[PDB]
Subunit: 225 residues, 2 copies
């Protein structure tokens, strides 16, 4: 099938481990510290992954950073969603960090995680494929609506290249549903909505000052408010 | 062209006037009171308009209300956006209520209105047509991601019917761009993002208690938090 899709598939990063500190007592602070540390390491991986998206590295450094600073949480959330598709009412933040309802309550994350589970529910019913997941991650990055873009036409071109990939993939692989590509695009509003909820929640956690956060995660959280 | 599109066009409501009270001194409270009163009357019109969308009235009353309670602010914002396309850096909330940057500052709405102007900017560059605007309003209603839907399959059918209308419209009217339908769908995340910003802002205004609000607007604001 479509080459961009195959390319994004082979560029997909390996999963990483959350490694919650086994010497630390379980608490909301430990859960939030674990999650923010995991996100920080995933953001390094995301920055490396984006260089494989056709045309991304040719943008200016400022436009590359603007796209990432707008889209980073959507990309993180799409990952948890995809890893959680074979599960029921649990979120696989990592293989060693699977959050059920009780854990979400303990972390203060019941509302955020229920919103993520709504994304999971919809993708389950659509039978989201890995091919579609990796293409949607790239589309979310290109379509992230940053206010600070320099070369608007080159970013529009990146959106078009990735949108064409999804269109071509669905036309070849899913002839039974001539509207599947659009159905996939129509899941992007709920992704944006959930990401905004997550950014606001963790920005408040940042302000409260009780959860330590690393440099990159803080810089992404700060580029967004 | 497509019959659903033509139908939504002829079902389009007439514009209404804001009628800011000429006896009241200009202030943030007057501006916010004027806007909330205008939105309340538009919501009555929106409820009547939705009955013309194929299949909407056959949903249950609860599903009809759930869709409207999720989508109402996106529909309101799409209207201001469309009315503002021929303007520059001003928002035509109504023919008699056009907000420039100074007025937005006075109302406490500079950030919200700048976000709406970002939607306007994108639709300007795409040369958004009235046909596309009315179809996107209906798609936003059907795709509003309510957590409380009873007949999920009938709502998915409504989404598909409206999505097919946009696809068919663009395939017939815009052969020069085989990805225009998807481009239109890809504007929906920023619409959802801006609507969430507006709902949160006016919910805070509701809590502060200094701006009087009418029953329907309050009930839509309360169904969302
Ligand atoms: O893959 C990850 C890792 C951490 C976090 C998310 C996704 C999203 C919610 C914020 C925490
Ligand atoms: O057509 C309208 C009328 C009033 C309002 C909006 C749209 C949206 C922002 C909240 C106020």
């Amino acid at each position: 099938y479509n080459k961009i899709v195959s390319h994004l598939l082979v560029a997909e990063p390996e999963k990483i481990y959350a490694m919650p500190d086994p010497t630390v007592p379980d608490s909301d602070i430990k859960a939030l510290t674990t999650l923010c540390d995991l996100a920080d390491r995933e953001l390094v991986v995301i920055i490396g992954w984006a260089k494989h998206i056709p045309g991304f590295s040719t943008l200016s450094l400022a436009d590359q950073m603007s796209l990432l600073q707008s889209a980073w949480m959507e990309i993180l959330i799409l990952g948890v969603v995809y890893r959680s598709l074979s599960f029921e009412d649990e979120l696989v933040y990592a293989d060693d960090y699977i959050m059920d309802e009780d854990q979400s309550k303990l972390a203060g994350l019941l509302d955020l995680n229920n919103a993520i589970l709504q994304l999971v529910k919809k993708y389950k019913s659509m039978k989201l494929e890995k091919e579609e997941f990796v293409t949607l991650k790239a589309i979310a990055l290109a379509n992230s609506d940053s206010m600070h873009i320099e070369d608007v036409e080159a970013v529009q071109k990146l959106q078009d290249v990735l949108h064409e990939a999804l269109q071509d993939y669905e036309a070849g692989q899913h002839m039974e549903d001539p509207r599947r590509a659009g159905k996939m695009l129509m899941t992007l509003p709920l992704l944006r909505q959930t990401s905004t909820k997550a950014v606001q929640h963790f920005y408040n956690i940042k302000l409260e000052g009780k959860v330590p956060m690393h440099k990159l995660f803080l810089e992404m959280l700060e580029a967004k408010v």
